[model samples]
Target: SHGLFKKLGIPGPTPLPFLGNILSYHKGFCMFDMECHKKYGKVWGFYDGQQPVLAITDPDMIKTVLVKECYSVFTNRRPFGPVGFMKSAISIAEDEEWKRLRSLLSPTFTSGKLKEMVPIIAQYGDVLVRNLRREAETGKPVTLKDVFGAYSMDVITSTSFGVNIDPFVENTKKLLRFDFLDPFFLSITVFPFLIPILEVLNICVFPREVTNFLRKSVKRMKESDFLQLMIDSQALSDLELVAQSIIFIFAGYETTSSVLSFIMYELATHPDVQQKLQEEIDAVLPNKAPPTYDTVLQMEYLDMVVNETLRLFPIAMRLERVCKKDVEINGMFIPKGVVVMIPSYALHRDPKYWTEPEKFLPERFSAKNADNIDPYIYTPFGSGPRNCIGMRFALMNMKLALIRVLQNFSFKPCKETQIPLKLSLGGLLQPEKPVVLKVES
Candidate 1:
């Protein structure tokens, strides 16, 4: 209710009994925050059931909460109520545990580690290109997301488990069967009160089948697998090991695939940008030239293109951190247990920082212009110590795929392509319609 915010002197829409401002956030929480920003300017308060949450878009306050000073106080995410063994997964782990897991897993994503994984990504990229080329021969609209999703699945399976389970070769059906849970997740997520109830009832966010499959997969993995790395180290328990592996498979595929879908759409619509990217790729790795880790790293324009795509369509609409201790920033008292949200989608589109904010502009991220931009405002991967642990892995995966595909084919909008993208109203920023493109080889 307003009981807490009233004493703190924070401002937001009036609450309605136990519901608080749930009506405003009925569908997409990000959209609701955007609406709140419209009325309350840069900083304001909102509520989820009885919990008063501070929804902020101000870069300075976001910087403070994410990294500058209040990071320790805001180390934990707003617990979505433990789902199975996920309570220990690094994504949702908290305090000393989060620190320990993060430290142990940090080296696995370092430049050296990612470099070793590059060849694996490129191998999948090769398969993806072949699949796309065959699909292109049919002259049918290529389901960009589905194709990329399959590729991402293959990459994660091969790299994370050290197994070559090619989604394209094996079958066309979904490898990860979590799509059925989207609407269900949306229902509980929108209605915050249900979270505690579900948690108390021991309702799991992940289904039993999914968890069982991951368990079996982990058991079968060789020493090359990331899970085996954890096992050999013995820093994590069996429960923790399985939990991390499950999350890696889940978080690994969707995020990378979704971002690639958006980037592909952008490239198809904007020929100038697409042409520039192709030119860079062509010059760096000519026909028959292998895509080495150092070669991809030198492709500065590729980095810029990916950054620009993320700026427009971030994988997650917002980044969340909970206040672990009382903290005051910009004369606002953010007490302990309050949720702090930085709307990444909205922040990326803020007119104040970006010129022609809605337009696709890769040059905005170029070295010449990037330095002038504020770092906090462009966090598609979130920020701080808790920032996405798979950032380097994801980036490398994306760049490898993009380079491989662009080298062989070009994407053009087909009849199914959404001209002005209509995104889904949910925690993720996804296209409502299938992003179908014409693939030319």
Candidate 2:
């Protein structure tokens, strides 16, 4: 059993009996895997308990599996099933069902549809800046992680459910606790086989209180709400509908919020870059007017800033695809049932693909310069047909928040702000400590 993978001409770390590499592996999975790439070459093998996982940093191999020969050869991902009502989300759905859900849901986030949600999203940004304005007035170092989390939640909630949420006001329901999903995923990591069991039990990932509240909230969804489009189609069950809503909120908010927090940190730490971004914002969106979908899309420097931030700190740090059929890439044979992982953190930073990979340079993404960059190596939203479905919505939400916030206040690193931010392990690329920033108006 020890030499099984080696017999097939694969290279990897030797595994211990029973536990395999699970114990020896570090908590920051991506960082750990990136180091593994440095130790073992591009296509190296590792075991999760008894399960063999191939970590890939080569962009061509990554493109081959996730894009070029996708669907036919690689289809599903390593199972990440949510218990309770979120089991049927498109994020985890497979095969034809995945296809159908994607087809049905794709239209919900088109340019036109996303534009319609801009007014509402902008209003939430107004509220967020007002909150930040207050923090600036007091000149206190504030944790942006909490601020952005609540702000992103409000934007996603109001746009998707038509409900205005103001955390400062009394009687507002707090939904940012979805961060708890991180630990639930950590539990799944130690016991990889428990996922299917949890799925069979119909157990939801969220606690009963969250699920109960969500179900009631789902009932209150307006006809104009994005989830309503899925509901009226009768294509998915009530639980499926509930799961999809959870997916939208979870996928929509946490990752987006995290990305915004990092951008703020970077902007604060790098005044030169922040000043350039502000210059672009002032010219494109004069007088701090609410951002239009088209105007935001047209801001060249803003786009570069977002791309640079995404390159530095990708929240969804890895992408995986399950081998549905045997495949070969440049004479390296990969058999079915193997999970091929594309580690974005390493790929984005590899010297072979990028010049000065560690530096924060927004100009690398400027129109004339970006054309030279390979699309595969720059994937933060991922690649090909199975790529993230809500990318357009996510971009719109982030741009609106950035445009609005920059106009009203500036983000600066406070004394409490940690340098070279430490990321948490387990589910996402989260801060090991609170992401603190001082707001200046």
Candidate 3:
């Protein structure tokens, strides 16, 4: 069945008898996909052994696949090992099942709903601020990246697991380090493409063992947490429960903070934005009353800053989908089953969409210019059915954290902060070197 190839017209790299384009996605997908688009045009193909697959890089095509759910649906994700048959509810489910589960879970995250959770968010943010100040005091540069990740982990744990395990303490650092382990996790994520080789060697890439541990923790969540709240009531699945937990940890931390730390770092670089944001944060949440969910919702400028950061530097690479049926996309005849990509990173940088795509101007989203943007073109959380579900939750945690942090501290990059930060391979992205900032009590 994997050989239903020529009928599909999927394109890929030429092979040397047996070898294939397996080497194509190496050198990191951000660089390689761009390189391939340049060499192969918008649509092309590659071969791996007897298996042939096609890839599309066109935005219109990507959008068509993602939005017109009936046509494109989700890709069979090239092939992943059975780490778990139904490990996490959200990622593994498809079609009507995905839609039904998502609909039921979506309401818990509505702005009105998320606002109710602010008191919970503040306790974690305070823990983070205390730890960051303590670390900054040593006169040794620290990775703000790690600090923000820790704060986010605290946020996710409280909301999902119903407990707090502060990484600020020494003994918990190892487990805390595991909490912020996505950069390490991506290494294993890449292992699936090579799974045939992996299977031959009798190895599994994802920490299936770790998943089992988290699974037990989630089950216990029913006893003492919101996750258990979901399960005992039967609104979502054990897989969905686990996926949401994973989503809370990975997406909650990395994407939100990459936006925030950069905003802070850039604001440090461009004092005016920092000053404006500080003015807003100070005026809005004067007493740092542990960040009420309803309070941060009203801070208009804070919303602008977060949205602007997302526009400037999206954390997730591009989103992927498989064309479900033959269809016309922006007038081009796109045959059924053609794989497509929306490089949100590339789309965000398109000159047609922004006047100076590289500049960090928050005004692009200001009241007037914001509405002028092509709605389909701008998406940091993505668009359509596959868009991020916890986006509202992620934003709430970030705006509140910044309000607290900026209240007490103003950040200026230390000598070590990298300019034109080189992205490391493993994690979402890092400052070619660790981002260090000077801090004061």
Candidate 4:
């Protein structure tokens, strides 16, 4: 049962019977992968339940797997056997289906389309600043996760579906709970064989009520929004459209919100960095004018800050791809069906690639220094054709919100602020506790 890695001459932690290394992931995938890479060198093997996964950290090998050989030998992500509307999600779609969906969805995220979404995102940014300004006047510590979560929800809802809802309103708070930590969903990681049974039972990995609500919400859309663009294309079926919408919201919401929260946390802790950024913002916007897409692009310091924050707290901790055919690269043989896991969190902090990796220094991404950094190692949105589809939209949304908030207020660490955040154990990288900070005008 545990002979696979041994037969392939791969070094990894010894597995116990059928469970493999799943139990060892108790510390969270980010820390676990970091530890595994330290012990097993660049190319090592690990098992998720009974599934064999090859973990690679070498840049040359990563380039070959993700970019060079992506279409030829690695096209699909690790299979989760998603059911119902989830089956049509582009994130999990395979082979020809993935290709078709990618082609159709690519047009919706083009520069012209995202440029049109600038004003929509900026409108929500104003609402966010208003909400936070009111909170700031109370002289109370604010939980940044909830604030950013609501902001992300509002932006994604209006930009993706052309529907406007106030996430800060009491009644709308229920919609903000996008559960990425469902217990039954977590169980599937340790019990891979249960996937088929769960699918037979018609169980969804995401909360059913939330998905059902989102399914109904798909009926609403305007030409400039994401849903309308898909509808106008007339390439997707009704189910596929709903699936894409749900996924878009899910993907766009938590990730951007989490990144935004972390950015604030870093800014709160590092006053000098925050002051420098504010100075840059003041210079660029001039008398607090609204930031255009072009204006945001021109702010070099803001880009560095965002890049540094993403480097420290990447949205997706790991990037994975399943081998479609047996392939050998640089004398490393990989068989069909093997899952390749590239732990981006660990790679981004690798001492060899980054100087003083743990510290938040945006200067590393300054134009002169950025040229020395490798694209494969600093992948916040991932690499190659299968990278995040909504990358540009998310960046624009984050930047617009940050610009608005920074123009009005500054964040300071409060008594409730966690000095060193404890991360939850899972796929997505997030702080375990509420990030509390004092908002100042």
Candidate 5:
């Protein structure tokens, strides 16, 4: 079958079983992936810490699996190991179960539904502004990365659960730092021979305290508007609660925060872009905050900036799927059971598709300009029936948060800020350093 690569057909460097690829893409995540894509050229097979794997970078090939073979070739992400708690809602579901969940959640992201949350979006944004100003008043340098993360967390928390989980409010917090769960999970998953031992001891990557902490929040939120909607469709259970909560945290808090912080850093270093964006925001929202929804949508420059920002450092770096049935790509058989990775990061910055792809330029996103480009080339949110179910929710969350933060303060790189950002794969796109910025009054 053209759909299956013969067991030996997969090419590239051989991987050590269980240490399939590199030992761990821990310290230099970006460079690690970039190196693999460079040497392998689109399709190559290897072991990633012991798991048999195929790393594919061709956008056309990715499109076939993610969109065209929508039927028999479908699966959700399996967190490397213990972070399986993340299997909730729609981000990483598989088989018939994921299909059902994605369909039920589609309406939740409709334009009208997402717009309804704007008032809540604005309210929480105001609280973030007040908090930042308070920090400035005390002469304390705000940690933009974590600060924005907390803001993003609050935005998601308010809408998802109708409450707040602002770790920024607490002097010390542990729950948010479980950001390392996925990596820890990966370390274990890629080392499955070790699993039997851990299981014998009833050990898992998720700590007892961490599970308890998330469990309380997940249970409490399931009773509100978020859970009410789910309950109407089916009985809500503790398992579903854990999965959905993890989705909300990962989808809403982690990625959104990373984007906002990156944009501010980009704006800080690139003054020309910053000035132009500020003009756009000031025209629509002159008074001291983000404008209402009507005006916010009309700010063309802001849209371009957001699009370009996504282009440079997309929050979604990779899309993974497992074949449920046979599929064909480039005259090759994609047999059932092999894992597939569509590296959106590699594709987004592909030089063949974009000019000077590494540089940040908002002008490239002009409506007239961007429309001419291939639709599949720019997929910050993976496209297709099974794509991110909460995409509108994320866009709405991000755009509104950006509006408020950008308007309330003018940012520029501080003395401590390093040039050219030492990439932060600290679980997501972030800076290696503290990302210092001088917040204006």
Candidate 6:
């Protein structure tokens, strides 16, 4: 019934019985959100099956939910069925458990620790550029999505586990596959009530084979890395440790790969921006030198390009937090168990907050203009306490990879490149087809 939302006086599309508005999401959640916002305005209601989800794109309301009342009222993400080992992961861990795990994991991503991992990331960046250089020499369009996917896997494994696995090597790509596409996982989205039965069966979303592989593969090293920090603390059980490690891989891998590919796509399509970014890289590094954490930070144009790319193609289409206790904000009442969503994809592109939102202009994030931007409106890494812990590390990894590649080559649109990239019809904001671009040295 639409009674809950109707009673709260929230406007939304009328939902179908049982299935609710889920079928509408066939076009992808981000696109669906863009449509909903256009039709119903900033605050609208939708259903994830029978569960009432309130989507808020208003910045003040978002700030209220994500920051002001976050700890007291919106501490947990919307609950799904039990995810076995993933339950111990910080992303899924709830309330007090989340607080505990977050505190433990927080120190692992500090600047000092990330700086230590820079060399490891750069080592893989060299390999990526070498492979791409070969592809460039052949004068064929490169499927950057696949290349960056492998590159992300390589970096994540080495940084998180201190194990160097070259993903470009034939059989190594097999390890990167997870069971997320399993029908069982898809079914749970439409029939959330199956969660209890799933819990009863003790089924894990991750395949046992992969978890076991990760469990066996985690190593101890005298390096400043995530696993080492967790191990040294002696605060986590074996399962917790493995869970955290896998979540780190899951969180860091696809998102980073997608962002890198999108940046390349944008750069390829926009020659002027690409030229400016390359110039910045050349001026900063001065001879294709290896990028340090600090050196990457010094490239202002690169930062603007990255920020603009994230604004245009935020990987996590929406950021959701479950209401812990009923509370009213901005004259609206939200009850316990309601999932409040921030439609980041739509929010980022909303003309109300951005000028010429469709155009690829990095100047919006330039130092002179950045201060005028609203913090809540442009949250690519999300906002408030539960924002991504690996933000700095991921940024460094992306910058290093981009710097190395840009020093040797420039991205250009090829015949196969999609002019307006067709996006995938799924949760993440990603290209539907391979992001093919010509690499010119």
What's the lDDT for candidate 4? 0.82
Give Cα distance to truth, residue 257, candidate 3, Å.
Answer: 4.0
Tens-digit lDDT track for model 4 on 1-441? 467789999999988666678778767778888898788888889887778999988788888888899888888888875465688889989888899999988887898888888888878888888899889999999888788888888877877777787712232343334232555545665677888887878876565676666666565442336776787778578878888876777666677887888999999999999999898898889788899989999988899999999999986888999998989987789888889989899999998899999999999999999999999999988898899888888888888888988898999999878888777665557777878899999
Deviation from truth (RMSD, Å), model 1: 3.0
Q: Write the per-residue lDDT of candidate 6 for residues 31-76, one digit (tens) a residue.
A: 8899998998879999876888999987889999988998999888
Q: Estimate each model's TM-score.
A: 0.91, 0.91, 0.79, 0.94, 0.86, 0.93
> On residues 121-149, what C-alpha lDDT tens digit does candidate 5 reach at each position?
77788888898888765655667867777
The residue pairs found clashing in candidate 1 are none
User: Ten-residue segment with the worst summed lDDT in candidate 6?
Assistant: 167-176
Ranking by TM-score: 4, 6, 1, 2, 5, 3
Regions of model 5 farther than 4 Å from truth? 1-10, 24-29, 83-89, 136-140, 164-189, 193-202, 221-224, 288-290, 425-427
Query: Compared to the true structure, candidate 6 yields what TM-score?
Result: 0.93
Model 3 is weakest, by summed lDDT over 10 consecutive residues, at: 167-176
Candidate 1: tens digits of C-alpha lDDT, residues 61-156? 888888876446888888766385679988788888988888888877777777788778867877787889898888989888788888888887
Total clashes in model 6, counting residue pairs 3 or more apart in sequence or in different chains: 0
Shift of residue 233 alpha carbon in model 2, Å: 1.1
- Misplaced by over 4 Å in model 4 are 167-183, 220-224
In every candidate, how many clashes are there?
A: 0, 4, 13, 0, 19, 0
- Which residue window of length 10 is worst by lDDT in model 1? 167-176
For model 3, how does the per-residue alpha-carbon lDDT over 82-106 read when each residue is reduced to its tens digit?
4343434555555566666676667
